[PDB]
Ligand binder design. Structure first.
Ligand SMILES: NC(=O)c1ccc[n+]([C@@H]2O[C@H](COP(=O)([O-])OP(=O)(O)OC[C@H]3O[C@@H](n4cnc5c(N)ncnc54)[C@H](OP(=O)(O)O)[C@@H]3O)[C@@H](O)[C@H]2O)c1
Ligand SMILES: NC(=O)c1ccc[n+]([C@@H]2O[C@H](COP(=O)([O-])OP(=O)(O)OC[C@H]3O[C@@H](n4cnc5c(N)ncnc54)[C@H](OP(=O)(O)O)[C@@H]3O)[C@@H](O)[C@H]2O)c1
Ligand SMILES: [Cl-]
Ligand SMILES: [Cl-]
Lengths: 297, 297
């Protein structure tokens, strides 16, 4: 195991396929660990040739053998509990576990499933969406942000070696909250059932700036070092996206799947409470998102 | 025209079919005036035999001849402008025009389309929903509230004579706002994409009471005579509905049709402004509803 790097991908979805495709094109053979059987997985980046990554997608932990050197976790955070048996099977104390999930709670959520492994949280900036036809559409290059330190630097080496854009940030808390401001705001799309062009409306954009400011106060109390300019920057960013760009949580709502509402929006309320911060806009959005996700009704 | 009463139904949808069916069963032959051609329309009240009302549904004003004695308008308020040529064709100064729409702006919206006719606003309490199979499902009896005065009493006579439950209320402003508190709250269902059982959640119910109180302040400034008890009563009412009961605005959202968002929710903001009343919860809900309805995205 000194030369060949054993890599497992747990969660071969939009983000997982994006990463598996880069690894495959670089010549690695990641072990695909999923929920829905398939012979392989396919990534189509706009403007590029398709990349097909051979499987099979394994759907029982009994079918695979560990330990592996690197485990890339790309399930939704709603699926972390169900993914646990993959981590038990595949991780030991030398495994590096990369958690490619939104929010700011990656290590806290996943570390207990691999208690002796180094966990590398990874902020992913990309637009990836599974199509009805079975392949994943990637619009633009993906970029990842990880911390500094040995495990994170090893993981960044692996991805950079395969052609990925990765930043090792000595202030990961700030990087994670920066992405969370964007993802939290994108929750509006789930309630309206509209793509990014909804933010081009004056009324929505005004509301959006107030919400991002409310989220920003919480981010700062939690240690994020962000300028006041970020409020309007977030709103300009979503307005500048292609008019039909959605978000993964809207795709889940349209497929009637559980949402990462607590990871992306509930977290604002939960973290606000120790600091005694008010979140009046979140107090409206969060119950509607949680109901949308979990019912009843 | 002293004995036979000429009746036209403009808008043969969920509510329109509900009313047409009662009239038909009483022996009237209402002229059906619609948008989508059909040979007739069908009402199925739960627990009762189906009632089929013969058409055809006329879809051009050129195909019909007025004036009529009673015109029953049951289009959505989003369709009032498109329905105008029916009113021009069918109404004269002796026509009674009944407006079976939600909100509190019936006379203001419709009177200019029939400037010399008496307009009777009608608050409808019912649960009617067009099914994929083409017939309308009615769950429970329908009840209507109209004002007092000659035109309203003539209209109530006609419906009561046909077996309908109708109240002639000397304080119609209060009756209209009472229904609007319910309908405004039901907007939550459109954002969450869930039926009435969503209100059984603690978080939603807490938010709901705050929203109904915000709406109540506006209703009172506009002349509604409602007790403080109404806030919790509205929330108990939606919780007590069958778990799968929706609202017409959710059905429109699911069919990708324009919503009555301004009639049911935008009105709270618009009326609050002359009284200098704050509407912070509406300031969140309304832009999301308007975007859901009208895009872009
Ligand atoms: N999509 C984006 O553009 C994007 C961008 C940045 C960050 N993110 C974040 O990245 C994370 C992953 O998002 P995604 O969009 O890739 O989600 P996704 O497309 O829904 O992918 C999740 C994958 O995990 C599989 N899965 C479910 N349960 C599993 C289990 N017990 N074991 C193994 N695999 C399982 C799913 O299969 P089934 O669907 O068959 O259950 C699916 O293939 C989320 O935290 C998201 O917020 C997404
Ligand atoms: N459904 C309920 O349980 C309920 C209860 C109380 C109050 N209300 C209120 O009652 C009103 C009517 O609601 P609804 O649920 O009956 O709506 P609906 O089922 O959508 O009915 C509207 C009808 O008008 C037709 N139409 C559209 N444009 C037209 C035009 N230019 N001329 C003539 N007809 C036209 C529609 O046809 P297409 O669909 O083919 O366009 C449809 O048959 C609304 O204000 C609503 O808020 C509804
Ligand atoms: Cl490197
Ligand atoms: Cl009577």
């Amino acid at each position: 195991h000194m030369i060949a790097t054993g890599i497992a991908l747990v969660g071969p979805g939009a983000v997982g396929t994006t990463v598996a495709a880069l690894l495959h094109k670089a010549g690695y053979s990641p072990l695909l660990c999923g929920h829905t059987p398939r012979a392989g997985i396919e990534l189509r980046r706009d403007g590029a040739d398709p990349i097909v990554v051979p499987g099979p997608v394994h759907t029982s932990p009994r079918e695979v053998a560990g330990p592996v050197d690197v485990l890339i976790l790309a399930v939704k955070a709603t699926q972390n509990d169900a993914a646990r048996p993959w981590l038990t099977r595949l991780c030991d104390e030398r495994t590096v576990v990369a958690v490619l999930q939104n929010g700011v709670e990656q290590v806290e959520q996943v570390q207990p499933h691999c208690p002796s492994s180094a966990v590398v949280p990874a902020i992913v900036w990309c637009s990836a969406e599974t199509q009805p036809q079975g392949w994943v559409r990637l619009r633009g290059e993906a970029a990842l942000v990880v911390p500094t330190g040995p495990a994170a630097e090893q993981f960044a080496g692996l991805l950079r070696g395969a052609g990925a854009t990765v930043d090792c940030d000595p202030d990961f808390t700030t990087a994670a909250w920066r992405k969370l401001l964007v993802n939290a705001l994108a929750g509006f799309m789930v309630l309206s059932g509209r793509r990014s062009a909804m933010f081009r409306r004056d009324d929505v954009a005004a509301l959006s700036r107030r919400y991002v400011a409310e989220c920003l106060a919480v981010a700062r109390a939690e240690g994020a070092r962000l300028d006041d300019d970020v409020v309007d920057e977030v709103v300009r960013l979503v307005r500048s996206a292609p008019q039909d760009m959605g978000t993964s949580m809207l795709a889940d709502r349209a497929a009637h799947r559980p949402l990462e509402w607590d990871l992306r929006n509930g977290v604002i309320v939960r973290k606000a409470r120790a600091h005694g911060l008010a979140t009046p806009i979140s107090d409206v959005l969060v119950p509607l998102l949680a109901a949308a996700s979990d019912g009843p009704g």
